[PDB]
Design an enzyme around this catalytic site. Structure first.
Site, mmCIF file in Angstrom:
data_model
loop_
_atom_site.group_PDB
_atom_site.id
_atom_site.type_symbol
_atom_site.label_atom_id
_atom_site.label_comp_id
_atom_site.label_asym_id
_atom_site.label_seq_id
_atom_site.Cartn_x
_atom_site.Cartn_y
_atom_site.Cartn_z
ATOM 1 N N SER A 42 -6.379 -1.793 -15.904
ATOM 2 C CA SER A 42 -6.874 -1.639 -17.277
ATOM 3 C C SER A 42 -5.777 -1.054 -18.198
ATOM 4 C CB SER A 42 -8.221 -0.924 -17.315
ATOM 5 O OG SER A 42 -8.791 -1.106 -18.646
ATOM 6 N N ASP B 293 -20.654 -23.448 -12.624
ATOM 7 C CA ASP B 293 -20.555 -23.010 -11.211
ATOM 8 C C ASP B 293 -19.881 -24.056 -10.309
ATOM 9 O OD1 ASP B 293 -21.007 -21.827 -8.658
ATOM 10 O OD2 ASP B 293 -23.210 -22.054 -8.833
ATOM 11 N N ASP C 279 -15.699 -25.715 -9.409
ATOM 12 C CA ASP C 279 -14.797 -25.334 -8.326
ATOM 13 C C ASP C 279 -15.181 -25.969 -6.983
ATOM 14 O OD1 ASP C 279 -16.854 -23.590 -7.157
ATOM 15 O OD2 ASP C 279 -16.432 -22.245 -8.825
ATOM 16 N N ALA D 42 -18.035 -25.369 -5.257
ATOM 17 C CA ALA D 42 -19.013 -24.548 -4.531
ATOM 18 C C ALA D 42 -20.129 -24.120 -5.474
ATOM 19 C CB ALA D 42 -18.342 -23.344 -3.939
ATOM 20 N N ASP E 210 -22.244 -21.628 -5.651
ATOM 21 C CA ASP E 210 -22.349 -20.302 -5.116
ATOM 22 C C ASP E 210 -22.652 -19.229 -6.162
ATOM 23 O OD1 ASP E 210 -19.928 -20.397 -6.362
ATOM 24 O OD2 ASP E 210 -18.791 -19.447 -4.720
ATOM 25 N N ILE F 251 -20.780 -18.593 -8.731
ATOM 26 C CA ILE F 251 -19.497 -17.998 -9.173
ATOM 27 C C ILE F 251 -18.703 -19.066 -9.833
ATOM 28 C CG2 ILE F 251 -17.340 -16.982 -8.304
ATOM 29 C CD1 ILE F 251 -19.205 -15.877 -6.020
ATOM 30 N N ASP G 194 -14.334 -10.412 -16.054
ATOM 31 C CA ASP G 194 -14.026 -9.204 -16.795
ATOM 32 C C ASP G 194 -14.647 -9.241 -18.150
ATOM 33 O OD1 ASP G 194 -12.641 -7.077 -18.083
ATOM 34 O OD2 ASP G 194 -11.004 -7.277 -16.657
ATOM 35 N N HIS H 200 -14.242 -5.856 -14.152
ATOM 36 C CA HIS H 200 -13.130 -5.143 -14.699
ATOM 37 C C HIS H 200 -12.756 -3.997 -13.737
ATOM 38 C CE1 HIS H 200 -10.332 -3.773 -17.657
ATOM 39 N NE2 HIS H 200 -10.918 -2.621 -17.757
#
Ligand code: NAG
Ligand code: NAG
Ligand code: NAG
Ligand code: NAG
Ligand code: NAG
Ligand code: NAG
Ligand code: NAG
Ligand code: NAG
Ligand code: CA
Ligand code: CA
Lengths: 498, 503
Positions: free
Chosen positions: B166, B235, B238, B240, B242, B244, B380, B420
């Site tokens: 940070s 999602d 990528d 997947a 998942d 994310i 983040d 973050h």
């Protein structure tokens, strides 16, 4: 006979402030004469051909034609223009007239694909911005009603590039001119588009500059884009289905220690920074959004249009002859300050950026908008930003907009023309791949208007000369096309819109 | 005995501009006392798992500035020196990081960054306190810490390290860029570099949202709807499904999808008005300034849940209000809601002590053999991860070094599923502190990866992170070295790290 009734119709014409040059009968199976086309298409249909000028102010005038087929469908159609022309699109006139439309085209208020006729003549600009196109509609409908006892029922528009802009100017500003509008790769946000075009030389420099990226380097850039981005859509097919997902990292092409950028296979830091600029949005004073990035994937042809280190004619002309009234002004000196002056001027709202389509919606109009994902002349992102602008300005969701306005990104398609993928969507003879409505956007629009059956997709073919290699259904925006299998990526049903 | 040596050290310290407050021996297994941690930084606990000699001191930096610092000299000493850094606009010693490092045997320092507390009010009328914050506190702690370490241990120290995130990531990059001789190995996370424009970008959010009563305002529930739509759209990019977004660069969300239909009202919290979608699009837009110059990247999509609190809630953003009040305008009444790009242009031109931290020429650090491992989390909500990517590209193109050339000394790892400077919902535990610890294998522990790189020449080709359930490792993933992208290809589940490829 149709022919005899044509070849004596001249005497009946009653258009005001006009000069009829000829009325001729054109049989099927001839190459259509082109002596009025300033410095060949084989008809497959007969028609009555009217050529005339119409005066549009004390200092401006149009040339136009109306093609009134013998096998008439009761439908009226207007074509549009290209670039800064100036040139009737005879190809599109023939396309439409072959389907039985009473078809018109105009020169847009001058002859030639250039801006010189704008110089000290705001009326010729007014013609280019809207008035020539609308005049051709007004006069064409008069002629059509005079010629055919039955008149016309529905009215259609077919055009791409400047013609796409012209179709959208109709939708936004002249809602009653057309019932159905097919608008490709539009030159809307016109002022900022023109500025964006000027910006390229400011980024590249000329061919001797340390910022300049050669054609062989652009090819390397292209190949690296394909490597990074082709497979994002699921199919390793050499095509970026949806360039929004492609955010290329051009630093991958910085030279290693044993390599020299003179080889064409790698770039210097300065050269990478030029390329990054190409792939960045343009912002103005006060940090306002001016124009989106060039979408990745259009590199090969974009070298010719923009990256070669020479002035961009359209911008040069616009700034010399409209913005600054300075015939010697050097487009290489373009700045965002210049763009702000041009934006403030916005002659006749040629910007064509009105997002409130309510008048056209409420009168029952339909508009089918497309843009190719490999467009090297007008970034496809401009059309996506426009769609979002309509949605957010009208407060209408996509599924609400679908009642009257549907937009279809086309993979594998260049500027108003085929590229290397399933681009042949029937927007013209050059993109023809059949007459099912799903395969031909002109006939899809007739189906939508007259039968209420709306296009859920726009199917396009990948042609090898005349043979269909495969087809793909291009999704209705905002849905994205993804390859899921289990079949080959040439299987249209191995793709899904999500 | 070590303890005796600690008990006799205070009298031996003789450092210019230093006032030594206390030297204390701290055994293993005790709560580390916090007498010198002011209430504003949490006052009084961390239980030591190692013994050390603890030196607390002030060091004057001008006639009107000074730092507080500590040096923790372990009895189980590895010959390595380490500095920690700070957070926010603080102001507070990161004792958690100090204990993390001192437990590996580093002679460890931290400073308060020249004032106490996470706020900018000590900047009021005091450029010297701003100077401390911009560079000079951290550097002073290094110089003074090295002296103390050399004085205390017969063997001195060999290599010097940095660990921070940070503000602390900015501090590590300031070191690389401006004090290349301070550290041999620098581990820098989610950096607050491009600091002025970062701060401006923070101020911009309120200008987009308005307050909770404005027509532009997007409620917390609406932001959750936005989040879920972004996961829907992005999602699977990528490979997947998942939950994310592995690389948010591919995520270019079409927020218009959440415009209300005719039977729906935005008061439901489930759909948005046009004005509200425009707000969200502005959050996901880059900020540009006068002359059309790039200022700061967009917020990366995916950080919405926590970004409602950090930025979207309709309240002034403190860090930016303090920076503009006390540094830019020198006017305690300045109202951040009035922020404009013209204000940001003023701030950028000021750039006090090059706090921007944007130098892309790292040749001096490269030439002296320094190594830097940079990371940033893809979720983040405080500092957009795109800032780190833009920085990487800036270094490459400024130095005219290709990624494989930079790999000799500077490697950067986007981390999916990470918040973050903390874990989120994915394989985020990479060993950048106690809170992200998942083992001592260097591939799983970025601190120890850096020791390996500097001392053994073995550079990190990937950074592996774990998805933890308490202290249980559910799965791991190898986060690729930028610019490569991590794509899920199977045949195994997305929990199998072998089912992902870097491309
Ligand atoms: C028709 O108008 C054009 C300008 O649009 C002018 O060039 C031309 O002389 C006129 N007459 C023609 C084409 O016969
Ligand atoms: C630089 O070398 C790396 C490592 O071999 C290679 O992957 C990369 O493609 C090379 N770059 C160029 C521009 O060829
Ligand atoms: C055109 O760019 C100007 C900045 O010069 C900006 O004011 C305007 O909004 C832009 N128009 C569109 C439609 O992008
Ligand atoms: C402390 O350092 C100063 C300057 O080097 C020196 O004059 C003084 O003698 C030192 N004190 C002791 C007790 O050695
Ligand atoms: C040390 O310096 C700080 C400012 O950084 C000051 O607030 C404090 O009073 C000084 N003394 C002590 C014991 O912390
Ligand atoms: C702030 O303004 C005061 C006057 O109120 C002035 O004396 C001072 O020099 C200014 N700058 C500071 C304090 O950094
Ligand atoms: C609006 O309706 C469409 C079509 O039913 C649906 O897909 C979409 O999710 C709806 N929008 C909202 C915000 O629920
Ligand atoms: C910070 O924003 C300003 C606008 O005045 C611009 O000049 C500067 O380049 C930006 N810096 C970075 C590192 O993006
Ligand atoms: Ca593909
Ligand atoms: Ca995923």
């Amino acid at each position: 006979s149709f022919q005899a009734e044509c070849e004596s119709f001249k005497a009946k014409i009653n258009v005001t402030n006009a000069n009829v040059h000829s009325v001729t009968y054109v049989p099927a199976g001839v190459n259509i004469s082109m002596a009025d086309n300033p410095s060949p298409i084989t008809s497959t249909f007969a028609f009555c051909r009217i050529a005339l000028n119409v005066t549009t102010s004390s200092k401006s005038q149009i040339f136009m034609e109306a093609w009134l087929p013998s096998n008439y469908s009761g439908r009226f159609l207007s074509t549009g223009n290209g670039g800064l022309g100036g040139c009737v699109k005879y190809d599109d006139m023939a396309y439409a007239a072959g389907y039985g439309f009473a078809t018109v085209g105009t020169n847009n208020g001058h002859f030639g694909n250039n801006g010189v006729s704008f110089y000290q003549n705001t009326e010729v600009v007014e013609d280019f911005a809207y008035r020539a196109l609308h005049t051709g509609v007004v006069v064409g409908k008069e002629l059509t009603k005079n010629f055919y006892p039955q008149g016309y029922n529905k009215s259609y528009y077919l055009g791409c590039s400047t013609g796409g802009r012209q179709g959208w100017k109709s939708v936004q500003t002249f809602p009653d001119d057309f019932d159905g509008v097919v608008a490709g790769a539009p030159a809307f946000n016109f002022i900022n588009l023109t500025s964006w075009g000027a910006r390229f030389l400011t980024l590249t420099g000329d061919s001797s500059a340390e910022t300049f990226v050669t054609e062989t380097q652009w090819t390397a850039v292209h190949n690296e884009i394909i490597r990074q981005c082709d497979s994002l859509d699921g199919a390793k097919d050499g095509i970026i289905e949806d360039p929004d997902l492609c955010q290329p990292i051009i630093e991958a092409l910085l030279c290693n220690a044993t390599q020299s950028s003179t080889s064409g296979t790698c770039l210097t830091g300065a050269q990478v920074k030029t390329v990054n600029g190409v792939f960045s949005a343009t912002y103005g004073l006060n940090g306002s959004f001016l124009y989106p990035r060039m979408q990745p994937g259009s590199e090969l042809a974009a070298y010719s249009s923009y990256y070669s280190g020479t002035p961009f004619a359209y911008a040069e002309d616009w700034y010399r002859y409209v913005v600054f009234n300075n015939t010697n002004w050097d487009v290489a000196t373009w700045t965002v300050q210049d763009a702000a002056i041009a934006n403030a001027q916005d002659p006749y709202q040629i910007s064509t950026w009105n997002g409130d389509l309510s008048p056209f919606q409420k009168k029952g109009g339909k508009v089918l908008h497309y843009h190719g994902m490999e467009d090297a002349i007008i970034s496809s992102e401009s059309s996506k930003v426009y769609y979002k602008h309509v949605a957010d300005t009208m407060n209408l969701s996509p599924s609400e907009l679908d009642s009257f306005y549907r937009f279809f990104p086309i993979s594998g398609m260049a500027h108003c023309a085929n590229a290397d993928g399933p681009s042949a969507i029937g927007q013209g003879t050059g993109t023809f791949a059949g007459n099912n409505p799903q395969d031909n956007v002109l006939l899809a629009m007739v189906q939508w208007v007259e039968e209420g059956v709306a296009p859920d997709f726009v199917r396009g073919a990948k042609l090898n000369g005349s043979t269909v290699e495969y087809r793909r259904k291009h999704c209705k925006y905002p849905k994205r096309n993804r390859y899921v299998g289990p079949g080959s990526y040439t299987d249209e049903n191995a793709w899904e819109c999500v």
